[PDB]
Amino acid sequence: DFANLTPCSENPAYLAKSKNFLNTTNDPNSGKIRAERYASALCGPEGYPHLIVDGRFTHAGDFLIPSILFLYIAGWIGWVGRSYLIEIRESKNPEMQEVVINVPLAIKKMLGGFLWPLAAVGEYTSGKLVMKDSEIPTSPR
Amino acid sequence: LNRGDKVRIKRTESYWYGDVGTVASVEKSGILYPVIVRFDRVNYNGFSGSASGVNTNNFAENELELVQ
Amino acid sequence: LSGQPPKFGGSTGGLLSKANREEKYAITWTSASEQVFEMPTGGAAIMNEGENLLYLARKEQCLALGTQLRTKFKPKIQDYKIYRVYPSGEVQYLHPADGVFPEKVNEGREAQGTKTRRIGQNPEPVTIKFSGKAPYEV
Amino acid sequence: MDGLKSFLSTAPVMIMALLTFTAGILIEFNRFYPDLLFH
Amino acid sequence: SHSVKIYDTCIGCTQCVRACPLDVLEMVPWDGCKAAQIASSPRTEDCVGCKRCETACPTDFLSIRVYLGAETTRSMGLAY
Amino acid sequence: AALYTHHQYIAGFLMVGAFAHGAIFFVRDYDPVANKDNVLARMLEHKEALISHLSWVSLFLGFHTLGLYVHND
Amino acid sequence: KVSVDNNPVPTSFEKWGKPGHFDRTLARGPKTTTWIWNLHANAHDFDSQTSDLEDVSRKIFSAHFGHLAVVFVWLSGMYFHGAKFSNYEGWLADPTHIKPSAQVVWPIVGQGILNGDVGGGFHGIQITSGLFYLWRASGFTDSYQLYCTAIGGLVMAALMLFAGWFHYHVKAPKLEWFQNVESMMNHHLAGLLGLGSLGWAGHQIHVSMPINKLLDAGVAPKDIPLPHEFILEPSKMAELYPSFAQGLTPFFTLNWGVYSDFLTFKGGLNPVTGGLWLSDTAHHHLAIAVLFIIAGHMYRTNWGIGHSMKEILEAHKGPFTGEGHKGLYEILTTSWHAQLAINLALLGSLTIIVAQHMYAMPPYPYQAIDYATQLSLFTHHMWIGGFLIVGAGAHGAIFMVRDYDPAKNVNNLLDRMLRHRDAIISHLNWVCIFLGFHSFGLYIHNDTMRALGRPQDMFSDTAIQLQPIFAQWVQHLHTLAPGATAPNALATASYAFGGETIAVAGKVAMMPITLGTADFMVHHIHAFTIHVTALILLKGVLYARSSRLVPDKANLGFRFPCDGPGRGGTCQVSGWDHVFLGLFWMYNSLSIVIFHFSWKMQSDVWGTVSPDGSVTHVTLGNFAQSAITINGWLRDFLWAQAANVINSYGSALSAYGIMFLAGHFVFAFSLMFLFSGRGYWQELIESIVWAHNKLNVAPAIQPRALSIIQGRAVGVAHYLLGGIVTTWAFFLARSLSIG
Amino acid sequence: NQVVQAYNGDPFVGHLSTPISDSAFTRTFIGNLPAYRKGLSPILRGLEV
Amino acid sequence: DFLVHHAIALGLHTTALILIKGALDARGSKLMPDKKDFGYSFPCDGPGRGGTCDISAWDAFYLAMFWMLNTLG
């Protein structure tokens, strides 16, 4: 319920501080736009937006929409980095392709990473994502 | 095992235990470790600050599992 | 031990009280010409022509100079003999122990420290917990 | 010119090319759309 | 005095003896490798323990080992 | 203040020394033959999965906890 | 004497795309991640790349040209930011009210708050480099003149880039051209320094002196005549200086006292600006110019007259020193590292001399009342000069490992230094223990006695006094120097020795600096910490080849980790590791020097001036009673004066608040590399390699932990990056706040 | 001439015969100090120390 | 209060990570498969094999003491 978190539209600490919001960019109304945007959040006793991350879809834009947007991009960086590393491993000189990146091969993989979650599920089902424990270098216990 | 045969190192003390290697030569002279195995990953070997290790080690028949 | 000392002006890196109380080390080599060698104590000394007798504090100092006699000189002095000198007058011939340099295999040498197994086939420390002996020992 | 293409495709240059382009995205997105604490 | 042990994975390329600065190691005849020689350690009383032999060993894991044991004047590398 | 800080600093010593003697256990007193396939051997068996996931959790926590503090600074 | 080789190295990009080609062990390609780090460590090690000294010296000459192109671009950037993004025209109208600023930040993510009000409506980063004070002393009036220097800096940088390519790929000089050191010293004393000082004395007389005399008279910067107008029309020039109309005839007929109106030995400071008189500096530079052009005729090159530097070194032998300086000429004409060790030692000493001279004789107008500029310029040139002194101990030890030949080094000074290594070091070891107990233990006695409520038992001015009587006598001799031992000097060399208090804008330019018990103790602290930094680096040079521990360290190299755990442990025995330990002690030495500087200026020099002549200081004279104790250094210096860096958030100085915490982090990040070691980290990576092998994302370039030297190199880099950035943000936020 | 030589003839003992360590004045002062004076019993040379 | 528990969680997990890796690699590792032969507390195995600074299981007690104090700090 967050009884100790008043909304920022009815928070007197935020209302006395939103009129003195500074401009972060060259726009002279940057502090006014931030005052209207942060009014919909939940504020504490010091009039700053406290974010709720527990899983409520009312506060889905606090963490879940950052979570969905991050994991897509971070999955994209990991998947095209993994797929480039697999492709250059089959070449004559796999070592030199890491310090001297085959840039046309890199752009080909990086634009193909928009369908990484469908490619990750399919490669997990095919067994080419996860290696078996018998086929991996192992410490001597 | 012939030259070019792919083996997996079952010798636990080695750097390549669980890694795949390629048989380079087998010595027919009664050697305790007659099978020379070449690897694509060098080991830790060398002084501190060295950019590479050694990719070759001699093994016996009991320490190799057939892969290819 | 016979040999003239190399012409050296003296140094503070040389022998200490251990040389005349516990042990000191002597290196004896025959020089072809009057050359300049780096002392392991710091500084440059000049070889006397013929036999040379140099007293050093450690066996490592005699062998660092002996390594310098092998590879840093064009005539390639390869007959240096290294002795351990005791204060009781005992002179013990150390290197080479059989007259042949140890990187060359020699007949009559006996295997010391050789183990007829791998390092990974050493016994566990739990099986010899109260015996004194190490896993590499027994 | 071919080795100039190889030098421009080296690991220091391409990570400085990408991070400049990544900072080029993020600064410009926070210039036209600043102050985004949440969605 | 330290313990210098040589195991049967020796290939006999004599690199431990050439890296030895204290004349601890030497090559004895042997029948277990192609070079027909194994390193031995008859002079571990002069062993300082600096492990230059283990750096020079090319086999995997190590065909020569130095185990640091009791410290004497010789093994502590003291000129005094 | 003195009572809380004393008991936490003592408990920090006791926790690290617990894993320290946990490591003296594997060095000295551990038998892989008698502990074959039990819960102690299997901790050694997937020790690479244990260390890398603890390395993941520490990096997952530390990149963000410092990252949110440096953001807030 | 000129001997070049026609096109030795072809110009192509084939080696640009093949990294590691310069080293034989890196040309085979990477196998581990150590190859990437070895690519950067060995990139400029030209002696390790090439055994030919001629090809080594050719790489060195062209790398100098490329380095000068970097400095000229950096110089051009400072003049371009002064021309385009600065209030220099605004500052030139009101130097006492407008703060200097030459960096404007873009408005993004709230960082536009750093564009503080520096006066006149301008908003930007308040600069502390002193460039505005330098340009006013150069006569810079309009921003177009700063812009033309910025274009000319890029032209000079392009010519530095062209001459680097020309002298490596087209016409590279031979080894005999490089080894003609008598020609090089004749062309650098009489050339670079002598004509450069003569050119600047010509600039100062014709440009700097008339413009600054009019700017101090009250003439607006719009109404100043241009520098070429003084050259073209000498009627304005003779109006400012009446004996200028006699022309060059009093110069050639030795009637030099005609020029005494603009070539003065005034001394002291200009009361209008607080800087040195440009009549003094032009007469300084001309007297400097005559001496180096005279001194650049000392050495014999082609025409018979002159000195052979070999024959000077051959003659200087004594009874204590054997053969003397014999063979040092062959050392310094064959070893580049031996010359670099001398040049880093003296340039590092020179930059410390520059810092120690520029605060007490401030050479620029309105510099001495900018307490931020005075604190920054002292601190920057202390840190630069201390880093170079550590590099002297580096390339001293690199020469001993690599280029020391004992065949041509028998019984000379370098042979005999090696022969009594235990005599030098153990006495240097003793004098560090004596100074450490008798400077720091004085503080510990003071810290204990003040804690026990015994102020009479302390070492202070109200207790057991330790007066620096020899420095007070030298200070007294300098105050009595005008009229007695410098009779033609109207004022003292500096008011730091004693005498007048100079006020410019209601702020002290310079006061007498009275040295008491606190100044005695902190100078012996400085004498202690310099001696340890000398102890670590001299032992690194002397014991680079051998010791009683490891007698074959010359074969091991200059930069090696150790010789194993044997002999108890030979950890950090290399000459590199003494540079590694010397960098910490240089940080420890210089941080106390700039802390002694920052406290003694604010407590006993800097402050505001009452109209009747009274001076109140920034920290109200707390150096005499609190700089005798570690707690006073903790409380009244560190805790009190960092209130400005921690309350700076939400203001223009909040970037200093960010960077003060930023350096605290990199300090703590260093101790991961310093305290730990790579066999933990290699054992940690190989579990992360397993999780990459689990998902088939293990790289072909095998991930390795850093080498032992690189683990020390990263840790000493972050410790000194973290520590200096902390002090930089502490000094800059405090000294912009005060005044 | 040359006032620094080998200490007592041997150049491989780690010491040097210097004007501080092995001068004529040094040997007649150090050797005539109580701890080194010839013929003194330890009770008198302890007493004078 | 939220951020500092995650610093505490970072402090506990990283201190556990050094300690568990010290315990699980106490018998050996790929850099040193004979750490049980060398005991719990040994300096190193020389600068060979790339360098083996602080490779012992005692040296992970050493490193986690800093992290335990940092967590307790």
Ligand code: CLA
């Ligand atoms: C402020 C100090 C500090 C920092 C941040 C680190 C950082 C870390 N420690 Mg620790 N460590 C420290 C001091 C510190 N430590 C000291 C004093 C010791 C005692 C010797 C150790 C002992 C130690 C051990 C023994 C272990 C750690 C581990 C690690 C990781 C912990 C997981 C984590 O938080 O990662 C996430 C957070 C970070 C990496 C911090 C972010 C760093 C920067 C700010 C962001 C990166 C971008 C950067 C700016 C790019 C550089 C560009 C620049 C060149 C211009 C990480 C590398 C463990 C590890 O590596 O396992 C995973 C490990 O086993 N450390």
Ligand code: CLA
């Ligand atoms: C006139 C200056 C001068 C010159 C000509 C050289 C020349 C050289 N030095 Mg150096 N030296 C000097 C000053 C100088 N030095 C000083 C000031 C120091 C004290 C620190 C030393 C200490 C020293 C040592 C300790 C070593 C050398 C060595 C080298 C050689 C190769 C360097 C190389 O390739 O690594 C290039 C490597 C780098 C450029 C990486 C350094 C990066 C630093 C740590 C961080 C940069 C600081 C930066 C401002 C902070 C921001 C970082 C980031 C945010 C961007 C070469 C002969 C090496 C050698 O073996 O000699 C034969 C070596 O081991 N020198």
Ligand code: CLA
């Ligand atoms: C565009 C013309 C050009 C090209 C194609 C070459 C080509 C060659 N030169 Mg080079 N050279 C040039 C101009 C050029 N040079 C100039 C301008 C200089 C003066 C510094 C020299 C001086 C010189 C030296 C002293 C050496 C070479 C050598 C080399 C070879 C390899 C260089 C390498 O590894 O590159 C890859 C590396 C880089 C491209 C460096 C990247 C930039 C670094 C960080 C330096 C940046 C500072 C820069 C000089 C000035 C900054 C400009 C300013 C505007 C910011 C190759 C045959 C080397 C060799 O092995 O010859 C046998 C050798 O020792 N040259």
Ligand SMILES: CC1=C(C/C=C(\C)CCC[C@H](C)CCC[C@H](C)CCCC(C)C)C(=O)c2ccccc2C1=O
């Ligand atoms: C953490 C640590 C490691 C692990 C560190 C490693 C393996 C290096 C990590 C390097 C990362 C991948 C990049 C470092 C940051 C770069 C300098 C950033 C470059 C610029 C970017 C924008 C690309 C050691 O190897 C080590 C060795 C010896 C003593 C102490 C330590 C030690 O403390």
Ligand code: SF4
């Ligand atoms: S540690 Fe050194 S002295 Fe001992 S056996 Fe090995 S190489 Fe020889």
Ligand code: SF4
């Ligand atoms: S122990 Fe290693 S270095 Fe010595 S002979 Fe055997 S293989 Fe060669």
Ligand code: SF4
């Ligand atoms: S650096 Fe590491 S391996 Fe080398 S001596 Fe020191 S502790 Fe041993």
